Design a protein around this ligand. Structure first.
Ligand SMILES: [F-]
Ligand SMILES: [F-]
Lengths: 131, 133, 131, 131
């Protein structure tokens, strides 16, 4: 399994990302940065449809994860990719937190924090992609 | 130290200097530095303990765009990420993704082989310089 | 004579910043970062209503200004501040580019770039603050 | 009258001067918000500009106090510093005079301590970075 969770969005790429930020902030998560992959492609002289990455998370929860296995800090804070395919359909892609826990071999001390990350990712993803 | 696409080497420098060496070597190769995330500082703002731990995000947009033209989902795992972190015994480690592992995860095709090899070269060169002396 | 331009916004602080970003990108400007002053006050245990800064600009235009007087790079890229007052009213505050031209003693070689910055700041502000 | 710009010569390259700003600032408990490579934006624009980099950093607790007095100073916060190399190879570090910013936004007497802290923070960081 890849651990990639991709859902269709009812909004454009820009609006989907702003819905991720708005919902993450309202649940007390910080927004760290946004990486406009589409704009980077345009400056390289290459073609790419709208593609944006947003990085967000709750450092309280992420710290407990890293206290168990520090290498998960490579994959934190939470990342979400909104992108438009060639047909004009918009998708929203995130990591399955349980898959991330398996990747870094997290233990029982991370259990509550993983479920918090599962709930946070699901709530933000469902809100941002739905109406 | 390799497991599940994670590559970890020991660094001869502090966490801060290791991240500075990542940024310097990447910029000298024409790559851009996108952001830095101080996980250690975030732990302190939360009132929790954590040794120095810092993430840096960098890469070459020309190479990354070619990968995303193949499978867009790899844009979730780009730009390149590196984590410098100090353990309890005072040792400093540098952890990066194996680019060939990230290519499998997103099922990249033959048309990405040149760009994947370039990503492997950039990752290995930055990591060797940052952790070495 | 502060060189501050402040107009009422028809949108919330978050929505006003989103409209700044969307309008800037559609005009070929890059978005460099966003600073959530209000969230920074909350992390410090202090009170502050919604307050957000966004930094954006066109490097082609900004480079011309810095080729003239490099110190203007301290005040570039373009900055915009959306903020809510105690009554709930939202404001959008930007620098007058002509005032920025005076602060750094720009010359005739920057005239086209200053006009472009005046046009860019004016177009982004009216769109974001207007409905 | 005045410009409010303080420029000192640095003994280090542009990149090293900026990294020394970040290192000193973070050691004092300030956050680093972003860096803007003006020189890279010039090369991407196809224009010639020597190395030029901006860094944005500050103490959000001290910034919040100032913004509680006059919110518009949030347009000019967090603290900004510009390292740049001239045509002869000399590197300069340019910052805002915090007292000049207090004048610009008409800060009152209640901000005087917070203004002094910004003066101390700016001077301490700049002396280390350029010296
Ligand atoms: F601009
Ligand atoms: F500050």
């Amino acid at each position: 399994d890849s651990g990639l969770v991709t859902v269709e969005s009812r909004h454009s790429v820009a609006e989907t990302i702003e819905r991720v930020a708005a919902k993450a902030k309202s649940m007390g998560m910080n927004v760290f940065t946004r990486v406009d992959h589409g704009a980077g492609a345009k400056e390289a002289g290459l073609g790419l449809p709208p593609t944006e990455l947003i990085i967000f998370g709750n450092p309280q929860n992420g710290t407990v994860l890293m206290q168990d296995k520090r290498t998960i800090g490579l994959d934190l804070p939470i990342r979400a990719l909104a992108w438009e395919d060639g047909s004009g359909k918009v998708w929203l892609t995130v990591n399955d937190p349980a898959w991330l826990a398996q990747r870094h071999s997290l233990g029982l001390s991370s259990d509550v924090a993983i479920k918090a990350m599962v709930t946070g990712t699901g709530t933000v993803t469902k809100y941002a992609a739905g109406d």
